């Protein structure tokens, strides 16, 4: 079943290649959506695809690239909008 | 590789069969550890095993059983201790 998850990731998550890494991981898992850094220092992302794939990426996001230290993730499930491909946005 | 994750799950997470469901899901993925309800209304869990499997379970934990509404998950990575099997504790 196709699901859509809206994430907010906190901790030491910027300046560690998080966006690039999530995109890489997303493509490998086949997840669509986007990711971006917010001015408050957190990371925001939209994941859309098969629940198994999205959940796998959510789990990975709690680890992130080597230098990342995620202390918390807030998820909001929503209705899919037809996202295609995973991109790094502003 | 083997990893250990300490979780704190918040939201509408108790009285929805979360513990039973996480145990079921854990056995299916082959994750070791435990889960339990805390008096402050949150859920606490320890997941240990191959990172791919643990991450999969963490992702699932953001969805949880049908009635569950997870608003936040706090993860803390630690050194594995040799957990074996997944159980529901007090
Ligand atoms: K940061
Ligand atoms: K990390
Ligand atoms: K649910």
């Amino acid at each position: 079943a196709i699901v859509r998850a809206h994430l907010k990731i906190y901790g030491r998550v910027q300046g560690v290649g998080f966006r690039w890494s999530m995109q890489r991981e997303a493509r490998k898992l086949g997840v669509n959506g986007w990711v971006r850094n917010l001015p408050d220092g957190s990371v925001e992302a939209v994941l859309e695809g098969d629940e198994e794939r999205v959940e796998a990426l959510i789990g990975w996001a709690h680890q992130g690239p080597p230098l990342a230290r995620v202390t918390r993730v807030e998820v909001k499930w929503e209705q899919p909008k037809g996202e295609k491909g995973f991109r790094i946005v502003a």
Side-chain angles (χ1 to χ4, degrees), chain A residues 18-50:
Chain A
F18 209 122
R19 291 173 294 167
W20 183 84
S21 300
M22 181 173 299
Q23 175 183 67
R24 185 168 181 276
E25 291 301 327
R27 286 174 172 162
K28 283 171 152 52
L29 297 156
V31 179
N32 304 282
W34 52 261
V35 58
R36 76 182 173 213
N37 282 165
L38 292 178
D40 71 348
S42 66
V43 168
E44 182 185 17
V46 162
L47 292 52
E48 205 175 83
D50 292 314

Side-chain angles (χ1 to χ4, degrees), chain A residues 66-80:
Chain A
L67 259 303
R69 184 190 279 181
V70 172
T71 56
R72 96 173 186 264
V73 168
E74 292 179 8
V75 177
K76 170 78 174 177
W77 295 96
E78 315 175 317
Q79 186 188 63

Side-chain angles (χ1 to χ4, degrees), chain A residues 63-66 68:
Chain A
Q63 181 67 282

